[PDB]
Design a protein around this nucleic acid. Structure first.
Ligand SMILES: [Mg+2]
Ligand SMILES: [Mg+2]
Ligand SMILES: [Mg+2]
Ligand SMILES: [Mg+2]
Ligand SMILES: [Mg+2]
Ligand SMILES: [Mg+2]
Ligand SMILES: [Mg+2]
Ligand SMILES: [Mg+2]
Ligand SMILES: [Mg+2]
Lengths: 236, 43, 225, 125, 128, 125
RNA sequence: GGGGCCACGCGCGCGUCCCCCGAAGAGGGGGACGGCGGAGCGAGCGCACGGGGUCGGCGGCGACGUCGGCUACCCAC
RNA sequence: CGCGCGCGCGCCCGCCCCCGGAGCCCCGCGGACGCUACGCCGCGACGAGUAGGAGGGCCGCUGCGGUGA
């Protein structure tokens, strides 16, 4: 299996024509002139009395509805979410500093590690300073500043995934009757594995931060707007 | 605007479209390096 | 005796795949010829005048063969003689348009309905943008979109016209089979000018839109389409 | 003939119902109970019908005898069958298909039967 | 719990109010029922701005959902069990509604059977 | 807007017979199918004349028929009418014919069959 | 050994013709063309996607004084 | 005119069942979830209105004949 011998020039067009690709992949010297209900097909079995038996798979229905619904027609390119192409704005690069502006950890300044395989960003506004841990965040509910540091030398573990930053609730074994149904401890409690992860990272992030002077107060402060500060004027 | 719906009708336009790109890029290359040559010859 | 029939159908599919591959090769090549045609007809004009400006002469180029026509005034307060001439040209509604060929018969008609129209001497790009984008066919006294060449050929291939480019050739070069190609087309339904007009009640010498605005018609088409 | 009977019975009939922009028919042996040529028991030389047992267990099937018409007393055959709802449908499917008795009524029969058997249980606990 | 119909497309109604007759706000001999005006000097007829609006066919409603309740079902009126059993097969498109003149002792019967056959009733608790 | 006129955009032909004679309507069911599913125009014509009214279906006389079929070439060929056949007592020599029509008078019926002729209907046609 | 050809399968011819070995023609290379022999040959996968009108094999929050309810009672603008 | 042109199976010669069901978009065995044919489906263009003319009214009021076990 050879990777494609036709390069790309623009999406949907290649750099070569028919006659040339013919010659490259050598379609010359590659000429191939190559030119009663009795049959019980799948089901089988064996048992005791009267001889043997032939058991029949995928048995027929019991109950038919009174009215059914027809099928759909076909379409081209309606992929699912696990198959899309992920994009990213240009002003976001590993080490950049970003302003959160929607949630509970609102209006804080944090640090960007990388982008996962779902379009969501991994953020550590290091817990000592901002009181903000490893989280997932959306690239569009955030601002990127023009203020940066060098992070290339750093070890992010493999096991850190969208499957790991997942919520876990909605338990079916319930009475289904009473003043209940958010009562299985009602609360969130922290594992140790998270702690271990936060420590092992900020150990090697944080020294790089202190190589910049005054970079801590910027990461303990909080952003806001005031009188005479119009945001389209101010560059970030 | 749509490549295929154009070319279902007129197939030759894929070739005319493949041309007019390679030509531009080649023409871009010459001006830049040559204008660079004189500029470096200025200073 | 079933296998004989199966083989008979599987053969007979050859009749259709081979024909289609042939025809798609046909359409390719003609367009490649037409490419060469249009260049020569462009550069040839230039070559003449340079050859003539070298001497002290001049060059009176040919006169145009076809025209594009738009209607700009409505249907309210109009004369009988003029209501007739428009509905021969198939302009029964505002901002519709049709091509037309030029001779003593046509030109006098255009002088009669001068104040209500705006016409010009178009180029090749405008013919492309009209027909592909906003260009439909008249078929069985219905209005049907040009999505594929089956429609064109089936109704119009007895003239040697089997695709879009063959029209455009037949139109741009006013050919022998112009009448049929145009009357196949429904009159183009356009949108109002993006950017605005100066004053529709006057001629295009007094700051208006009416009359002949020969080469500047194309500037306008960019904004209606 | 059938169409002749029909062209009288479109609009005027005692089994006819017309209210609320709907139109139903209540003649015996009418599957889907609508006013139609394809679905009407009194019109054809071949018809099939399905009803519930009077004792209150199983399904009653009805088929016409084709030989002596115009004597309605002994024109209809009946059977009552009471099994586990997969044997019951399969039995029906075999009657119609293997005898070619009006085979454009197959699934209509089945849906009517299943409806009955679904009802003919403790639908309430 | 509640019997689900087969499909539940969204419903859209071009007009939601009613059309009142003209000059019915002044007077009491005049009613709310639409009667078309036919005078010469009249301005609803002549369609000025800021006036009553007259019903035409463009307000007309889509046909996939016409006479369709908010619950997806269409309606049907009964008087006894006999004409109820005709709905067995259309038990997911149409619903039942019992008349006003039926007695208490018989409503119980009809409900008891509609519940078996899975035929929804749009007024199951009236007299009691 | 569009400067056109709507005074002549409905056409004033028939689409169906205005009567409730049911035997007529079954004939109409038939010839629509043949007109819809065949490559002929004979079918078209007949369909158009079964809609017509009765002053557009005047009676044909046994006399004219003989004159029009004794002409050369029209030997052995069927005669077809969309109305009534009367008798003309001013004719004595009635030869062999193969007529098709809707109605046929009684005196005319006898003479035609007594020459060895034959009478058909549109069904058997 | 320049960039470019919807060029193409090669074995001896089906041909009008021609550059040349060759006398106008046959034989040799091919070309312009028609084209089809004295050859032309045809399965299994996939991207499909700028292809005959949208799907998510993607999610979160919320509960005896709160949720929904155009239409229909009042008031304001 | 190269998505069939002679493909396959036993032993060139022969077989050449084949949908009471092939295999995926044409099956010339019969059929729509549609077939109240006074029905169902699909395309494309149009919609001002006095006097006035026509049609459809499962809009309505009182009574007669049949019919809703
Ligand atoms: Mg005016
Ligand atoms: Mg603007
Ligand atoms: Mg102005
Ligand atoms: Mg004026
Ligand atoms: Mg309303
Ligand atoms: Mg007036
Ligand atoms: Mg009018
Ligand atoms: Mg008229
Ligand atoms: Mg009107």
């Amino acid at each position: 299996p050879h990777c494609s011998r036709n390069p790309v020039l623009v999406r949907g067009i290649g750099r070569y024509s028919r006659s040339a690709m013919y010659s490259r992949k050598a379609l010359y010297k590659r000429k191939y002139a190559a030119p009663v209900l009795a049959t019980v097909t799948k089901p089988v079995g064996g048992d005791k009395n009267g001889g043997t038996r032939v058991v029949k798979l995928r048995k027929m229905p019991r109950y038919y509805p009174t009215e059914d619904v027809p099928r759909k027609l076909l379409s081209h390119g309606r992929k699912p979410f696990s198959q899309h192409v992920r994009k990213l704005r240009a002003s976001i690069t590993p080490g950049t500093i970003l302003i959160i502006l929607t949630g509970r950890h609102r209006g804080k300044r944090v640090v960007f590690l990388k982008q996962l395989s779902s379009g969501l960003l991994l953020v550590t506004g290091p817990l000592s300073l901002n009181r903000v841990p490893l989280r997932r965040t959306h690239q569009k509910f955030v601002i990127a500043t023009s203020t940066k540091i060098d992070i290339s030398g750093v070890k992010i573990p493999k096991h850190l995934t969208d499957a790991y930053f997942k919520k876990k609730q909605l338990r079916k074994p319930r009475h289904q009757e009473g003043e209940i149904f958010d009562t299985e401890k009602e609360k969130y409690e922290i594992t140790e594995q998270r702690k271990v992860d936060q420590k092992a990272v900020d150990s090697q992030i944080l020294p790089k931060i202190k190589a910049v002077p005054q970079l801590q107060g910027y990461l303990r402060s909080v952003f806001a707007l005031t009188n005479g500060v119009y945001p389209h004027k101010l560059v970030f | 605007k749509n490549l295929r719906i154009m070319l279902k009708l007129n197939p030759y336009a894929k070739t005319m479209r493949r041309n007019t790109i390679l030509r531009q890029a080649r023409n871009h290359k010459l001006r830049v390096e040559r204008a660079a040559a004189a500029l470096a010859a200025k200073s | 005796n079933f296998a004989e029939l199966k083989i008979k159908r599987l053969r007979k599919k050859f009749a259709q795949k081979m024909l289609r591959k042939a025809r798609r090769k046909l359409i390719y090549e003609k367009a490649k010829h037409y490419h060469k045609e249009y260049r020569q007809m462009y550069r040839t004009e230039i070559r003449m005048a340079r050859m003539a400006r070298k001497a002290g002469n001049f060059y009176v180029p040919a006169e145009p063969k076809l025209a594009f026509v738009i209607r700009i005034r409505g249907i309210n307060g109009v004369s009988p003689k003029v209501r007739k001439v428009l509905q021969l040209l198939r302009l029964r509604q505002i901002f519709n348009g049709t091509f037309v060929k030029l001779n003593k018969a046509s030109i006098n008609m255009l002088r009669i309905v001068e104040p209500y129209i705006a016409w010009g001497y178009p180029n090749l790009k405008s013919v492309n943008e009209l027909i592909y984008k906003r260009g439909y066919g008249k078929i069985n006294k219905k209005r049907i979109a040009l999505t594929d060449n089956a429609l064109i050929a089936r109704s119009l291939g007895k003239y040697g016209i089997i695709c879009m480019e063959d029209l455009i050739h037949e139109i741009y070069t006013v050919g022998k089979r112009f009448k049929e190609a145009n009357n196949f087309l429904w009159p183009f339904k356009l949108s109002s000018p993006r950017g605005g007009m100066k004053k529709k009640t006057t001629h295009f010498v007094e700051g208006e839109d009416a009359g002949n605005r020969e080469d500047q018609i194309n500037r306008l088409i960019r904004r209606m389409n | 003939s059938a169409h002749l009977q029909w062209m009288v019975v479109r609009n005027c009939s005692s089994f006819l119902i017309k209210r609320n922009k709907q139109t139903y028919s209540t003649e015996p042996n009418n599957l889907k109970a609508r006013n139609s040529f394809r679905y009407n028991g009194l019109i054809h030389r071949k018809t099939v019908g399905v009803e519930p047992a009077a004792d209150g267990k199983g399904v009653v099937v009805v088929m016409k005898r084709r030989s002596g018409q115009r004597k309605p007393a002994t024109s209809y055959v009946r059977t009552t069958i009471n099994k586990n709802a997969r044997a019951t449908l399969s039995s029906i499917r075999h009657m119609i298909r293997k005898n070619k008795y009006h085979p454009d009524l197959r699934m209509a029969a089945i849906r009517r039967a299943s409806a009955i058997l679904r009802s003919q249980k403790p639908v309430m606990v | 719990a509640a019997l689900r119909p087969l499909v539940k497309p969204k419903i859209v109604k071009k007009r939601t109010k009613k059309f009142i007759r003209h000059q019915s706000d002044r007077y009491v001999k005049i009613k709310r029922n639409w009667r078309k005006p036919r005078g010469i000097d009249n301005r609803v007829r002549r369609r000025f701005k800021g006036q009553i609006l007259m019903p035409n066919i463009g307000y007309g409603s889509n046909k996939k959902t016409k006479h369709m309740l908010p619950s997806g079902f269409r309606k049907f009126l009964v008087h006894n069990v006999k004409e109820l059993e005709v709905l067995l097969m259309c038990n997911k498109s149409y619903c039942a509604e019992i008349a006003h003149n039926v007695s208490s002792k018989n409503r119980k019967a009809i409900v008891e059977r509609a519940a078996q056959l899975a035929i929804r009733v749009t007024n199951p608790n009236a007299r009691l | 807007g569009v400067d056109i006129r709507h005074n002549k955009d409905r056409k004033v032909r028939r689409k169906e017979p205005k009567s409730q004679d049911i035997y007529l309507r079954l004939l109409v069911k038939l010839y629509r199918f043949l007109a819809r599913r065949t490559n002929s125009t004979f079918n078209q014509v007949v369909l158009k004349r079964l809609f017509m009214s009765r002053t557009n279906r005047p009676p044909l006389s046994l006399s004219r028929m003989i004159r029009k079929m004794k002409l050369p070439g029209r030997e052995g060929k069927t005669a077809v009418v969309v109305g009534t056949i009367t008798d003309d007592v001013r004719v004595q020599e009635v030869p062999k014919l193969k007529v098709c029509a809707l109605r046929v008078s009684s005196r005319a019926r006898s003479r035609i069959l007594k020459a060895g002729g034959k009478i058909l209907t549109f069904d058997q046609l």
